[PDB]
Design a protein around this nucleic acid. Sequence first.
RNA 1: GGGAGUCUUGUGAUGAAACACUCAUGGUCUGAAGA
RNA 2: UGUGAUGAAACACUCAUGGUCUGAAGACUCCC
RNA 3: CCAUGAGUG
RNA 4: CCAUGAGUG
Lengths: 375, 375, 227, 227, 122, 122
Amino acid sequence: KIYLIEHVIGAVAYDENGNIVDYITNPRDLGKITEELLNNEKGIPFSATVELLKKVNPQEVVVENEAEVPKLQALGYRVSYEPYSKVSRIFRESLPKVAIDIKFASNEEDYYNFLHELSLEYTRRKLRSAAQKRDLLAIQAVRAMDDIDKTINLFSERLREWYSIHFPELDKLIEDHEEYATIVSRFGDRGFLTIDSLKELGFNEQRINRILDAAKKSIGADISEDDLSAMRMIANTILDLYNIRRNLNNYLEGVMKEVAPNVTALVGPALGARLLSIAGSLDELAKMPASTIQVLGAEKALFRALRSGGRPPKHGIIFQYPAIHTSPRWQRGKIARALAAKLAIAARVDAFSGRFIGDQLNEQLKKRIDEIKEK
Amino acid sequence: KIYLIEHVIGAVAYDENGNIVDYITNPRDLGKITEELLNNEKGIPFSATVELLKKVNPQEVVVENEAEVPKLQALGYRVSYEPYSKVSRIFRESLPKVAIDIKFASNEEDYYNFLHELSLEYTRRKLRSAAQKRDLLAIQAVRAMDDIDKTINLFSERLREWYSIHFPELDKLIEDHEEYATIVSRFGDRGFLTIDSLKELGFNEQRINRILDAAKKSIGADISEDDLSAMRMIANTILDLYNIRRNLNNYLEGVMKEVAPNVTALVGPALGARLLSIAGSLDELAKMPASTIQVLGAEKALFRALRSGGRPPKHGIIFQYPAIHTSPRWQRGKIARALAAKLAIAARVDAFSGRFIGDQLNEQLKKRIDEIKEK
Amino acid sequence: ITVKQTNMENIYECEFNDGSFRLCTRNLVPNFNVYGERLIKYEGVEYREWNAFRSKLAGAILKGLKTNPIRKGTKVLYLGAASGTTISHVSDIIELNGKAYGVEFSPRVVRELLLVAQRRPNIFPLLADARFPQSYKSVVENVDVLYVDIAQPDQTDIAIYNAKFFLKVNGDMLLVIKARSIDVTKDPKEIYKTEVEKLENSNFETIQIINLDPYDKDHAIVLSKYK
Amino acid sequence: ITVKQTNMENIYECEFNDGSFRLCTRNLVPNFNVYGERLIKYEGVEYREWNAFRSKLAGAILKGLKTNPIRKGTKVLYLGAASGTTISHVSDIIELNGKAYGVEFSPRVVRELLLVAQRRPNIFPLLADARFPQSYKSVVENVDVLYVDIAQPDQTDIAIYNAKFFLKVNGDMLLVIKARSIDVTKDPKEIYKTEVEKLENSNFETIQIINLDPYDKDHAIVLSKYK
Amino acid sequence: ASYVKFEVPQDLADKVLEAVRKAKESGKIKKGTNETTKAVERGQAKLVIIAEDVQPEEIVAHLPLLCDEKKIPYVYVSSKKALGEACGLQVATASAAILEPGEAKDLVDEIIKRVNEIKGKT
Amino acid sequence: ASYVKFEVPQDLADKVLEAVRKAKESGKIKKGTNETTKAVERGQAKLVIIAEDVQPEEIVAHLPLLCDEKKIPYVYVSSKKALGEACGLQVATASAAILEPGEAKDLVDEIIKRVNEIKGKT
RNA sequence: GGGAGUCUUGUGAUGAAACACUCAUGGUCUGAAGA
RNA sequence: UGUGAUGAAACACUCAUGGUCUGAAGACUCCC
RNA sequence: CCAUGAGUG
RNA sequence: CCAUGAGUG
Ligand SMILES: Nc1ncnc2c1ncn2[C@@H]1O[C@H](CSCC[C@H](N)C(=O)O)[C@@H](O)[C@H]1O
Ligand SMILES: Nc1ncnc2c1ncn2[C@@H]1O[C@H](CSCC[C@H](N)C(=O)O)[C@@H](O)[C@H]1O
């Protein structure tokens, strides 16, 4: 019976007593060790392990890691693992020393000089594979889009408050923020309004006269061009911002179809993106129960109920789903519960690499929405 | 003794009992009444009131307004006022009716039609003189700056967390936000960084290489040009908003040397504007004791101490004054108290139409500051 | 749906589709709402849904205003008209015969009061400080009811002053007490008592003292008669 | 100003310009600071100011930690290394001879751990999940001290699993119990009794139980010996 | 001076200066411009006294406005040093206020009722 | 299916289903995928039972990962209808959890130890 | 320790809790009945 | 309908108005 | 929402 | 920060 070890130091064999039966030392080479370190994660034995499994030819072999066992059985051997074995322990208790003993390094002095540089480089590599994930861009993109949403709304309320020093009636005449900033951008003084800039917006002729009269009889304040230009800087930024949102929206749409097609199919790209931002990743989203996905984003209300034993929230960011916020209070709960359910199914096929199945999920979803609404 | 009444209805004289001695009805003309109601606010007598004091030729006149009293004296009569006289009530007790009696209108039906459209017009007018105040622009402007201040910070924080998916090493290498923003905006992929476009920013040759070496050695992700151009939308906006802020700070200075020079003289346009925003107007800041100005902008902190008998805030938005946030903790309290004192004098000399005196106000202030610092 | 009169003039309750009950006033300018309220037709008449949570007067009623001095054909001085929420509804109540004068010294907000005051000949906008009743003196007459919902530390002292200008003897005054806008330190229940004594030492005959909670926290309305 | 040794190796106190007393360590990498900490020279030697409010270790020290198992040349496995605030200071304590293996599985944060791990040969950074020590089995040795500061509901179990891999017998574990991250409903103090029992069932000998409040709310640190 | 709204005769002026003094002793006063402003906002002041030689004037120009909004009567005295040394101070004061008249109730009631006559009130 | 790491002999698969049943009576169990997920998240399940005939495969795929994180053993049964109908339901179930074995202690402890031998554990 | 003056100061001495934001980790409802 | 039935408090903001600290001390110098 | 670690204006 | 009246995404 022979017990087997895997490390930067190489591959070593022990009898159960804790004596090195045979060893094959690793190359003291950063590049190569790193790789075999990444590989032993997936079950791949060090190359030094395969040779050592050859010099002594043991009837019973046992390793540290359970992902290795199916690989080594495929080489012909009878293999198992004992994770935190007396041998593995006996092995590291002597790691100050046995690096020198199997002649991996001359002294204790530059074993750590190296093990450090490997430790530096092994993780530097993982830092990269992580940044390389597709879903991070999906998350950062929509967080940023929402940062713009907030901003547009803020400036618009400033600009309405600000421009109304000059032209108050205009505020209550245009519901749309984008339409309004566009008026202030193009014209300036209230007295420069002309019909063609107004027919260019999409404004129907009836509104057009109501606007031109409003400007005429305005009890507003007469103001310098320096004052108007100030307002218009704020106005123009609002317009810029509206464009970028749509660009980002398109950018997000692609990504959200690339990394997470099924989830995107159910609730659309942003909200799918949104849930990716709260969970942190797709794979973390996938492992979630529906009862959690249902309330993601209502953390204040959730922990209020859980602390106090009061009533919980029906919906978190899931609230944005058109069906939910259009529908009455008693339907929302049943719609959320059903939706979240479909969502974990949507998510799980995505992360665990399933091919697109979003259609029947939708069908399944809209069905349950119909059973619900028919009461 | 004749008690004199003044109304939209015209000008009335009464004996002490409340019996109509004589009248001169106003013309049923919106235009003249609106101007005379505004004039009577400054004490100017109705023109119709002027005639009535000629026909009847009274020893003693008494008016409803104490502001009117000196005007009619300058006109030659002996005048006083009784605020809520029994005659004034008697007049108005009979106002549904005596409107018809003196023939201002035929009936009740359209005296009320008129007084309604006077009131619409009389206040349409007052609504406009309010809009005409210059400090309003100062307030709206500086509100918009702080809005850009916030946005920039937000967008800047987003770009960095985002752009670090590709090039994580640039974040902690460039302390300043705008600078970071230009680098994302001119280049894109880290692999386009060049000494020349980078020597164009002003980067000392040493930091440029620290930058370029980091770009070479980046454990960030190789990422497409769509992702990158998406991030750049945000980088550019950060740049637009800084340019716009720099314009608004310049606009603001203009309005602020104009409407409140001494305040400005002391604390500058931004901070001064800011106190105008908080007080509501220049004339509200003028009326503040320093004990308020000193705590304007600490309302959470203030009332917390006021409700409970706790410790008060030392300073409010005043925290922004260089002397205050730089000087050690024990000095802030006194500097603030001294600034606020001067600010209130300054605000008061500015509103009540004083000329610039900011030189000595600063001199006096740096005195109080130099003393504080020598302990 | 079902709509029927209540014990008070021009004021109704509604039975609804589900079995819910909400106050309303008879719409003086049909098809037009000053805030977002439901418009409801019942036997072909249009009424305006009167949210108590927004208007102090509906609160006082739904909190038991025993009797209401504002009715069909009443003349009122309304200090603090603001955007026009409550005064639009008293327009529905006093109903053309009667008249309402709106004092309000805040222009950002009179801006929207203009609108409510165009559509309605009941309502007479006046941009003034109720602390100087001299400035609006020359546009109004005397009134039966003095409705005061103004944010001031001496709101009551103001109210008393306007009172001795314009309140007909034996008129009713509805004075709204804002504890937290008189003093956020003091206990609200302590304040109402301390202010009601203000009215009674100045000879108002307190008819009823109403606490608005939950319609309005730390709020009370007093009805008293002027002598 | 004066600097002097304390009862614990390579950990120092300062008499200051005013008379405040603050912890610090002998700076392993002079002229260089990992968070914003003050650098202080005395008789020509440089120390790093160890803010207890950021670092849990300094808290437990300032709260009467009986004995410190971290000293000149200790080999320590540190689960949940995060930004490197605390682990930078245990570098100063162990001093080139000693070795510190730092686990942390949030890439966003290992990013700055990297910077700290570069100047310091004391520190061996590992982007990994402390729940699977199979992953860092192939880089580390066995250790004298197991410092576990991870925000996890099964943080205690993680510590334990990690111990029977890397904890020498008669070696020590410093386990930070982060109550609100274990269960936000239970009383923090109930949490502590249950977790220490966990230690005591795996033949850990509870040596000392410290509460980090006021430096860290609802937090406790356990020092115990593995048998 | 322009923040000076109406005219004070030195007999009227003096009854004030005595009136202040008895109110330190028997009542309650607030001394200083900032305290007088707070005293008015608060409706604690029963009588507000303003000096005529303030420089610059605009320092106390706001008190007439405030006193009418809160309907508090105001009066002038000619020297600020004189109003301070009444106040129990050894330096000047530009404005002062009586919140509690005390054993000057009768004396204040005479002044507050006299500046009304010179203001044209019946 | 691919989310099943190892192979269950039907002498073990059935001794599984029986251990579930005794746990409804004498112990405490949980049924359904979302609840198993929580019983695994919370460290309540001692044994987690996942079906092999689930459609689509991805629904229960996260459980192996999870369970290895919380070191909670997991086992497969061949039929989904049977696992649900075992639970005291008349419908299928994709995954379940035993929280307290009750009178399946000796029975469970034997399973988790046989599924260990089949996993190559010493 | 007793006595004594000088400068600053109600045009404000002394005391004394300004505010706005981003990231990372964990704590993340119920569970068999429904028409 | 356990591939989740029933119950059941999603989140980000703007304007207007009022409530908006303390109050006479602090630093120096010369006599036995 | 609570707790922890890293920062910005 | 509290209260009140009007509004936004
Ligand atoms: N001094 C004053 N004079 C007149 N109105 C004032 C005032 N001070 C405050 N107000 C106004 O009083 C209003 C209180 S809200 C009350 C509005 C009205 N009661 C309604 O229910 O619709 C505020 O909008 C405020 O602008
Ligand atoms: N399972 C896990 N494995 C490794 N690290 C984990 C973990 N779960 C949480 N963590 C990390 O534990 C850290 C706790 S913050 C720790 C502060 C730091 N140890 C110091 O005192 O300086 C978080 O950064 C989190 O990322």
